[PDB]
Homo-oligomer: A and B are copies of this chain.
């Protein structure tokens, strides 16, 4: 008998043990959490608006011919502003994939600009990390621009940018324009206007949302905390909750506000998690603000929301699509528990089960490769011929990569986890493709973390191994505590 587990696509994955029974408040981001934007339509809209802003501000008319290609960008790429590269890197700064425009650079050539295939993430001035779902269009746009200027006759390619006559245009200054333009599209409400004038096209709607939030509110408190203003929030949330019946079968509809003990807009995250801004109440009928302490607030800070709800830190499960630094953990008061929404997980899981044959083959090749070396040790002069096998391993591995997209898996390249995966393991207690998967779990559930196995763990059997062990290895090899010395796996 093997362990029971819910169906794969309904699962909530566990990084750190979490006893859901102790959770008293449920907190939601809105954007890409409750309001899931349809893909690739939303990225494309963001792409078009940014390109148009750039053109309206001096960039060549050629850009208007770019079309967003959803198959190219993977989230979490690092843009190197010195050399104009998109880089997929691991948790430690090692290069996995390097693309200059649409040209993927192989290993040997990479060492020219990166002699140890290494970058220092610390160099925030040089390296910009494109972690967010909103960063997707600009990730593609950056590649489009570098490709454009590289192959445009009017320009002269250099190491750190382009010559336009006697004039130099660095990748760095070009990056600033793109960054400024993306900011512009968002904060000018250009994007927001187009989204609300066509909700069906851009925003996913699902009857399960009101059901899950309903059930949460029966067991504890529910709050929203979004950077968006009330007006846009009201438009979006009305849409999400717009069904002829409430969530209980045969029940009548009710306002989205009804599902919340506390609604917070203009959150200004991430400053919100520090001292944020003064909390003010919102009169929804007039739109008049008033500092101090209806259930609609603007601004404030995470500590203030925690006070308003009568919650302590670890009583709160905060659900959202965004990875924040160690900011919460640094404070002297208890930080929140976290649930990270990662929509790509939906596609990634499909590859995991539907491309089963590719994994199979990779495993056979590995098994056969080990056979070739089976009889060899340090006294062996033999050099088995493996070039055919490797060649096939590379071909199958690349096919697998392409299953995810041109930039491969969000979580890995080959045997290496990405910086993004590493950040997920660091910040998220739980994760899933959507928060709606909580539907499939009781509120008393004990979320238990599975071990992440090191090589000597994953590849050594618990079977007792039947010559003496070298003393070079064994080194010639207080009242002890009578009760368990740690408690992180039970969450108590």
Contacts and interface: CB of A to CB of B under 8 A. Distances in A.
Contact of A417 (B92, B360, B452): B452
A190 interface: no
Interface in A24-65: 36-40, 56-60
A342 B11 CA distance: 37
B414 A165 contact: no
For A147, A442, A453, the residue with the greatest tally of chain B CB atoms inside 10 Å of its CB is: A442
B434 A278 contact: no
A488 interface: yes
A406 B489 contact: no
A275 B97 contact: no
Contacts of A369: 446, 448
Contacts of A326: 92-93, 118, 120
A166 B439 contact: no
Interface in A356-386: 356, 359-360, 366-367, 369-371, 373-374, 376-384, 386
Contacts of A116: 313, 328-331, 334-335
A456 B428 CA distance: 13
Contact of A376 (B300, B406, B444): B444
B433 A96 contact: no
B346 A94 contact: no
Contact of A120 (B107, B204, B277, B330): B330
Contact of A490 (B172, B301, B394): B394
Given A177-B277, A367-B3, A456-B11, A206 B390 contact: no
A470 B328 CA distance: 31
A167 B279 contact: yes
Contacts of A421: 454
Interface string A454-488: 11111111111100011111111111110111111
Interface string A168-180: 1110111011001
A393 to B, nearest CB: 7
A292 B165 contact: yes
A243 interface: no
A158 interface: no
B401 A484 contact: yes
A379 B473 contact: no
Interface in A41-91: 56-60, 69-72, 88, 91
Contacts of A382: 442, 444
Interface in A214-254: 215
A50 B290 CA distance: 17
A37 B115 CA distance: 37
A112 to B, nearest CB: 11
Nearest to A59: B291
A301 B462 contact: no
B307 A166 contact: yes
Interface in A405-461: 406-408, 411-417, 421, 424-426, 431-446, 448-461
Contacts of A473: 9, 343, 345-346, 432-434, 436-437
Contact of A485 (B106, B206, B412): B106
Interface string A253-282: 000000000000000100100111111110
17 contacts: A8-B465, A13-B459, A92-B326, A92-B426, A107-B487, A116-B331, A116-B335, A204-B472, A346-B475, A349-B460, A353-B465, A376-B444, A377-B439, A383-B444, A386-B446, A415-B450, A415-B452
A173 to B, nearest CB: 5
Contacts of A58: 278, 280-281, 289-291, 298
A102 interface: yes
